[PDB]
C-alpha cells in the first residue's frame, strides 16, 4: 500500500547512485586496455566522472521547467529511458576505436545520464515528508539514501564476482577481454531498469511563476529565514566536493596506498583494487547510512552533521600529512572512517536538513537550489581532482578536503534543528505574531 512507493524511490536512488560511482571502478579498466603504459590523462577522466554530475543539475533545470508546463504527466519513466538509452551507448563504444575518442564517447553518454538523475531528485523529497506531515519522518528518508551505499557497494561486488569469473581461465591468456568487463558493470543495471519500466508501467505561466517568487523572495528577506538556506546550500557544496571528489576516484586514491601492487599478473592488479573498494565501502560507505538511520531522530542532524564534518576532517588531515611517510595500514583505515562519517554525518544530513526546514509553500525552490549547490560542489572536485593530484600533489588536496569540512562544521551553525519540528506550523506561529 504506502510502502510500494518510498521502495521504488529507493530503486531510482539506488539506480542512479550505482550508475554515478560505477565509474571509480570501470576507470581502472578502460586504462589497462586503452592506456596501458601511461595512465588515464588527468583532464579526460575528470570530466568523464564529473559529467553525470553536471548533467545532474541541468536535468533538474529541464525537467524542472518540463514539470511546470507539462510535456508529460510528471515526465515518469521519461527521465528512465534516457539513463537507460545513455547506459546502452556507454558500452557499446566499439571496440576498436582509438583510446581517446572512446572517452569523449563516455564522457557525453554520462552527461545525458546525469539530466536523467536530475529528474528523479523531487521524487524522492516530496513524496514521504510533505504527503505525511509526521513526526520521524527522517529515518523514512535516510533508509532512500542508503541506496547511496549499495549502489556504491553492489558496483564493487558486481566488480570482484566479475573479475573473478574472468580470471578463472580466460585472463591467463585473453587479456583484451576486461574490454567486455566494464561493458557489462555499466550494463547490469538494465536489468532493474526494465523492471522499474514494468514497474512504471504497470497562458498565464510566466504571471502565475513570477507570483511565487515575490512571495520567495519575501520570504528569505528576513534573517533567520534567511540563514537557514545558507546552512543547507554550504553544507552539502561542501560535502560533495570532498564526497564526490572522493568517491569518483576512490580507486586513484586506493592507487596512492599500497593498494597498487608492483607484483603480479593484470588479474591481481585488478582483484585488490576491487577488493579495496568492496571493503571501504562495506565497512564505511554503506553502514554510515543505516548509523545515520538508526539516530537522525534522536540525536539530531545539526549534531551528526558537526561529527560528519570534523570526524572526516580529522582523518583527512591525517591522511595527507602522512601519506607520504606511513605504510598500507594506518591509511587504510582513516580513509574507512571517512567515508563513514560522510554518510553518517554530513552527506546525508545535508539531504535531509533541506528538506526539513521549509515551509511547503517555498520547499521546492530552496530543496533544488541546495541540491544543485551540492553538484556544484560534487562537479567542481569531480573536475578538478585528477588535475591538481600532479600540479600540487595529493597531499595539498586532501588538506582542501580537510577545509570544506571545517567550513561545513562551521556553516551548520546556521541551520535549525528540524527534529520533531513541522516546518508548516513553524510558518503560521511566526505570522500571527506579526
Same mark, same amino acid.
Given at each position: 500500500?504506502?510502502?510500494?512507493?518510498?521502495?521504488?524511490? =529507493?530503486?531510482?536512488?539506488?539506480?542512479?547512485?550505482?550508475?554515478?560511482?560505477?565509474? *571509480?571502478?570501470?576507470?581502472?579498466?578502460?586504462?589497462?586496455?586503452?592506456?596501458?603504459?601511461?595512465?588515464?590523462?588527468?583532464?579526460?577522466?575528470?570530466?568523464?566522472?564529473?559529467?553525470? @554530475?553536471?548533467?545532474?543539475?541541468?536535468?533538474?533545470?529541464?525537467?524542472?521547467?518540463?514539470?511546470?508546463?507539462?510535456?508529460?504527466?510528471?515526465?515518469?519513466?521519461?527521465?528512465? !529511458?534516457?539513463?537507460?538509452?545513455?547506459?546502452?551507448?556507454?558500452?557499446?563504444?566499439?571496440?576498436? /576505436?582509438? &583510446?581517446?575518442?572512446?572517452?569523449?564517447?563516455?564522457?557525453?553518454?554520462?552527461?545525458?545520464? &546525469?539530466?536523467?538523475?536530475? &529528474?528523479?531528485?523531487?521524487?524522492?523529497?516530496?513524496?514521504? #515528508?510533505?504527503?505525511? @506531515?509526521?513526526?520521524?519522518?527522517?529515518?523514512?528518508? +535516510?533508509?532512500?539514501?542508503? @541506496?547511496?551505499? /549499495?549502489?556504491?557497494?553492489?558496483?564493487?561486488?558486481?566488480?570482484?564476482? %566479475?573479475?573473478?569469473?574472468?580470471?578463472?581461465?580466460?585472463? #591467463?591468456?585473453?587479456?583484451?577481454?576486461?574490454?567486455?568487463? /566494464?561493458?557489462?558493470?555499466?550494463?547490469?543495471?538494465?536489468?532493474?531498469?526494465?523492471?522499474?519500466?514494468?514497474?512504471?508501467?504497470?497562458?498565464?505561466?510566466?504571471?502565475?511563476?513570477?507570483?511565487?517568487?515575490?512571495?520567495?523572495?519575501?520570504?528569505? #528577506?528576513?534573517? @533567520?529565514?534567511?540563514?537557514?538556506?545558507?546552512?543547507?546550500?554550504?553544507?552539502?557544496?561542501?560535502?560533495?566536493?570532498?564526497?564526490?571528489?572522493?568517491? $569518483?576516484?576512490?580507486?586513484?586514491?586506493?592507487?596512492?596506498? &599500497?593498494?597498487?601492487?608492483? %607484483?603480479?599478473?593484470?588479474?591481481?592488479?585488478?582483484?585488490?583494487?576491487?577488493?579495496?573498494?568492496?571493503?571501504?565501502?562495506? $565497512?564505511?560507505?554503506?553502514?554510515?547510512?543505516?548509523?545515520?538511520?538508526?539516530?537522525?531522530?534522536?540525536?539530531?542532524?545539526?549534531?551528526?552533521?558537526?561529527?560528519?564534518?570534523?570526524?572526516?576532517?580529522?582523518?583527512?588531515?591525517?591522511?595527507?600529512?602522512?601519506?607520504?611517510?606511513?605504510?598500507?595500514?594506518?591509511?587504510?583505515? +582513516?580513509?574507512?572512517?571517512?567515508?563513514?562519517?560522510?554518510?553518517?554525518?554530513?552527506?546525508? %544530513?545535508?539531504?535531509?536538513?533541506?528538506?526539513?526546514?521549509?515551509?511547503?509553500?517555498?520547499?521546492?525552490?530552496?530543496?533544488?537550489?541546495?541540491?544543485?549547490?551540492?553538484? +556544484? =560542489?560534487?562537479?567542481? #572536485?569531480?573536475?578538478?581532482? *585528477?588535475?591538481?593530484?600532479?600540479?600540487? =600533489?595529493?597531499?595539498?588536496?586532501?588538506?582542501?578536503?580537510?577545509?570544506?569540512? !571545517?567550513?561545513?562544521? !562551521?556553516?551548520?551553525?546556521?541551520?535549525?534543528?528540524?527534529?520533531?519540528?513541522?516546518?508548516?506550523?513553524?510558518?503560521?506561529?511566526?505570522?500571527?505574531?506579526?
Amino acid at each position: 500500500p504506502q510502502i510500494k512507493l518510498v521502495l521504488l524511490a =529507493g530503486v531510482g536512488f539506488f539506480l542512479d547512485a550505482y550508475d554515478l560511482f560505477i565509474i *571509480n571502478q570501470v576507470a581502472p579498466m578502460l586504462a589497462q586496455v586503452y592506456f596501458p603504459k601511461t595512465g588515464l590523462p588527468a583532464q579526460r577522466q575528470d570530466l568523464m566522472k564529473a559529467a553525470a @554530475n553536471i548533467g545532474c543539475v541541468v536535468g533538474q533545470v529541464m525537467f524542472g521547467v518540463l514539470g511546470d508546463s507539462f510535456g508529460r504527466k510528471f515526465v515518469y519513466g521519461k527521465e528512465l !529511458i534516457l539513463i537507460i538509452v545513455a547506459t546502452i551507448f556507454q558500452m557499446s563504444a566499439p571496440s576498436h /576505436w582509438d &583510446g581517446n575518442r572512446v572517452l569523449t564517447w563516455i564522457t557525453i553518454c554520462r552527461v545525458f545520464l &546525469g539530466i536523467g538523475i536530475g &529528474g528523479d531528485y523531487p521524487m524522492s523529497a516530496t513524496v514521504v #515528508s510533505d504527503r505525511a @506531515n509526521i513526526h520521524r519522518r527522517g529515518t523514512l528518508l +535516510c533508509f532512500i539514501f542508503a @541506496n547511496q551505499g /549499495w549502489g556504491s557497494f553492489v558496483g564493487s561486488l558486481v566488480t570482484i564476482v %566479475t573479475i573473478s569469473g574472468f580470471k578463472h581461465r580466460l585472463k #591467463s591468456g585473453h587479456t583484451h577481454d576486461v574490454d567486455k568487463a /566494464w561493458r557489462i558493470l555499466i550494463g547490469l543495471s538494465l536489468i532493474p531498469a526494465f523492471g522499474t519500466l514494468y514497474q512504471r508501467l504497470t497562458h498565464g505561466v510566466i504571471a502565475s511563476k513570477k507570483a511565487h517568487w515575490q512571495e520567495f523572495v519575501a520570504y528569505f #528577506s528576513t534573517w @533567520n529565514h534567511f540563514r537557514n538556506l545558507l546552512g543547507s546550500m554550504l553544507g552539502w557544496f561542501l560535502v560533495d566536493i570532498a564526497f564526490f571528489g572522493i568517491n $569518483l576516484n576512490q580507486s586513484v586514491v586506493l592507487a596512492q596506498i &599500497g593498494f597498487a601492487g608492483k %607484483t603480479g599478473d593484470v588479474y591481481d592488479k585488478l582483484f585488490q583494487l576491487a577488493t579495496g573498494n568492496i571493503i571501504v565501502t562495506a $565497512l564505511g560507505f554503506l553502514p554510515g547510512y543505516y548509523f545515520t538511520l538508526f539516530l537522525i531522530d534522536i540525536v539530531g542532524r545539526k549534531k551528526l552533521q558537526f561529527m560528519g564534518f570534523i570526524m572526516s576532517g580529522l582523518f583527512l588531515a591525517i591522511l595527507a600529512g602522512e601519506i607520504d611517510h606511513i605504510g598500507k595500514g594506518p591509511l587504510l583505515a +582513516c580513509f574507512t572512517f571517512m567515508q563513514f562519517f560522510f554518510n553518517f554525518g554530513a552527506n546525508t %544530513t545535508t539531504f535531509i536538513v533541506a528538506a526539513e526546514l521549509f515551509p511547503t509553500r517555498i520547499r521546492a525552490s530552496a530543496h533544488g537550489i541546495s541540491a544543485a549547490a551540492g553538484k +556544484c =560542489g560534487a562537479i567542481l #572536485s569531480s573536475l578538478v581532482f *585528477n588535475q591538481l593530484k600532479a600540479k600540487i =600533489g595529493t597531499s595539498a588536496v586532501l588538506w582542501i578536503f580537510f577545509s570544506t569540512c !571545517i567550513l561545513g562544521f !562551521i556553516s551548520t551553525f546556521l541551520i535549525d534543528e528540524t527534529m520533531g519540528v513541522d516546518p508548516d506550523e513553524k510558518d503560521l506561529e511566526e505570522r500571527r505574531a506579526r
